[PDB]
């Protein structure tokens, strides 16, 4: 719709993301993963190493301005994959903030995790 | 100097087998003069280094 | 002399080791040499 | 000859190789996971608060400029400064002299 519109209490963006993976391979990243007080294990002494997490998660972002979130909440199962390849629900990613210029949760998962599939470029565009 | 234990600064004597072993009575000397010193203090007089 | 008491337990040294050991000699050659009037040796193993 | 052994009984530490190389890894993954976990909640806080609620933080510093004073004396108040001299000095000295 093309104009002016500032009735920024009814903008919204219910976004469901794409599932994010992480292979925990040192203890440091399990150091860094409990230091998220989103990332909330059902059992708070599960073992992550050598673990598979994988994250669905859906982010609800509410605004103010044009810039600024007024309420951002990212939420959704934390997974395991089991040795027999069948992923289990072992947490929620369960983050809540109000006034914010962004959403660490996605953030965070895009720089230390994967998307389960990677496009790769050839070398040079074939054209058809 | 407790029984059965080295202290941290001790000498030693060469044994008739060759080899250095912690010394008892040597260690003693060294460590009272260490006493000395760290009350009365050493002089050092007609000393060339 | 200063002596350690490290004979190539920490190694990457060169040839320290080989030469705070061979200061020990000097404990045996102040018998069986001619120099013991003109010069005493006290070895100290200096630790950490 | 004297051998004294100043060692501080380190001479009774078994394998002191293995055994400080142990420590100074257990020092640098204690220092090496909290660097990273300080560098991901400085992350968080960056997204979450952008460079608006950051900005409040830092505050304007004052370098010095070179102030050149010429050094005058320092004239103290009278009363301190007829303590020094004898009360007979005043009105004694030919001031032209």
Known sequence: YRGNYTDFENTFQKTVEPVYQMHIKTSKDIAVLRSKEWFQLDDEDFDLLNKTLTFETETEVTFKNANIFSSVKCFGPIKVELPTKETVEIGIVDYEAGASHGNPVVDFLKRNGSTLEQKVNLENPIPI | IPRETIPFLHLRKKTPAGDWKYDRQLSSLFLDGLEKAAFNGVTFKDKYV | ?48 | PVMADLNGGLQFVPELKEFTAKLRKELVETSEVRKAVSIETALEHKVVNGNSADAAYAQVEIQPRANIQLDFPELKPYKQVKQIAPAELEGLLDLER
């Open chain 3, 1 to 48: 002399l200063p002596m350690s008491p490290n004979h190539g337990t920490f190694g990457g040294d060169g040839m320290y080791s080989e030469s705070k050991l061979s200061l020990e000699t000097l404990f045996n050659r102040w018998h069986s040499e001619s120099w013991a009037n003109q010069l005493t040796v006290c070895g100290a193993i200096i630790g950490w």
